[PDB]
Symmetry: C4
Subunit: 31 residues, 4 copies
């Protein structure tokens, strides 16, 4: 189903957002 495929996409998009958050936090922490 394309509804499921589309949900996969949305999920992935949230994971990229999380990775951007982490990139910021790693710099705040001087990593």
């Amino acid at each position: 189903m394309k509804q499921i495929e589309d949900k996969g996409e949305e999920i992935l998009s949230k994971l990229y957002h999380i990775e951007n958050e982490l990139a910021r936090i790693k710099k705040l922490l001087g990593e």
Copy 2:
């Protein structure tokens, strides 16, 4: 598919939670 939908909802729920927890951490570190 109704079950997959429930798993899709639970997953997005958790993702938003994680995003918000990381946003609170970034906010606190920036202070």
Copy 3:
């Protein structure tokens, strides 16, 4: 499909793991 349902489950399980990591990090940071 049950293959997709089972993948949903695995994904969720990783999100719980992430939440546990975060719980630890929030305490390290005195939140």
Copy 4:
């Protein structure tokens, strides 16, 4: 389903990444 499978793989890939990034942060904070 082959496409959903590729999205499932990309998602798990990202999750492992995030888990490892958070593990490195917890390790560094505990030092």
